[PDB]
């Protein structure tokens, strides 16, 4: 029931598909169990997006949880708006003995509104211990832009804080800036993992992903070796990168030669695993691609050797 608040809620409601109305709307708690029966969810789209917005017209909806609704929308649609991964690093000393959720929500909002004074920062501490920040950016001259926010999934005590690579404005050095000040770290480093599958980034960065008698195949001793090296470089259940794993050359052709190799697959690490057995790749498939999760980063920055 406000400007760019009711309209923002309306714009983020029809985005979700017809199946997950109840699942998303139970989470943000504006609709108590009594209010869910008033709206009939099964008739049409424009009917539900009009009666649901009315239920917060009577609830006097505010941007603080209007952004939260977008947060739960993104938690079920994290496989869009390809995520950056930032990596914090404290110096020498003891750990952060006081990462209060209250203090972190305060120490992020304070530093973010210190310079970006017009923002609607809305945290939603998830049950997997991963603070799901969403920041609606906008300079002091303008209102906070909720059209394209920058969701930040800071895993609570982890150095790593995934960030939705939405625009990469002059705020992305301040997004890391307030992230490394709220969480008591010292340095922010984009580790150069840029994948659209957040549940796949979480596994890669935290290393939580693997924890006939007549037909005589003449090259059977070679196919077995191909399978062995494929099963020794891709052990089991390769995670889905689904990201443009860039490879920007600076290599002399055997002065230098530049190209920008971009692997584009719906499931990258399971496509490379099915390359050597398919004959597209050599059996010792190059570390160059196999150590994409083992390096926890797919936009590399090292040089020739």
């Amino acid at each position: 029931m406000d400007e760019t608040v009711a309209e923002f809620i309306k714009r983020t409601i029809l985005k979700i598909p017809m199946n997950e109305l109840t699942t998303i709307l139970k989470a943000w708690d504006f609709l108590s169990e009594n209010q869910l029966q008033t709206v009939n969810f099964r008739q049409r789209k424009e009917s539900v997006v009009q009666h649901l917005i009315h239920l917060c017209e009577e609830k006097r909806a505010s941007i603080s949880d209007a952004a939260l609704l977008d947060i739960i929308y993104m938690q079920f649609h994290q496989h869009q708006k390809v995520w950056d991964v930032f990596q914090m690093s404290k110096g020498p000393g003891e750990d952060v003995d006081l990462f209060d959720m209250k203090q972190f929500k305060n120490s992020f909002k304070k530093i973010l509104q210190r310079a970006l004074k017009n923002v609607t920062v809305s945290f939603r501490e998830t049950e997997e211990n991963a603070v799901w920040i969403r920041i609606a950016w906008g300079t002091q001259y303008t209102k906070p832009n909720q059209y394209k926010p920058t969701y930040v999934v800071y895993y609570s005590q982890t150095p790593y804080a995934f960030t939705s690579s939405s625009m990469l404005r002059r705020n992305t050095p301040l997004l890391g800036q307030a992230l490394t000040i709220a969480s008591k770290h010292h340095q922010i480093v984009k580790m150069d993992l840029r994948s659209r599958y957040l549940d796949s980034l979480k596994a890669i960065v935290f290393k939580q992903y693997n924890q006939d008698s007549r037909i005589i195949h003449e090259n059977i001793v070679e196919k077995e070796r191909v399978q062995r090296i494929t099963q020794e470089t891709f052990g089991d259940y390769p995670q889905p990168q689904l990201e443009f794993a860039q490879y920007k050359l600076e290599t002399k052709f055997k002065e230098p030669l530049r190209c920008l190799i971009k692997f584009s697959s719906p499931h990258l690490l399971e496509a490379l695993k099915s390359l050597a057995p398919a004959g597209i790749a050599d059996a010792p498939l190059s570390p160059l691609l196999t150590c994409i999760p083992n390096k926890r980063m797919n936009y590399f920055k090292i040089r020739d050797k």
Partner: peptide, 5 residues
């Protein structure tokens, strides 16, 4: 790339 970017 030769793991240059």
């Amino acid at each position: 790339e030769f793991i240059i970017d």
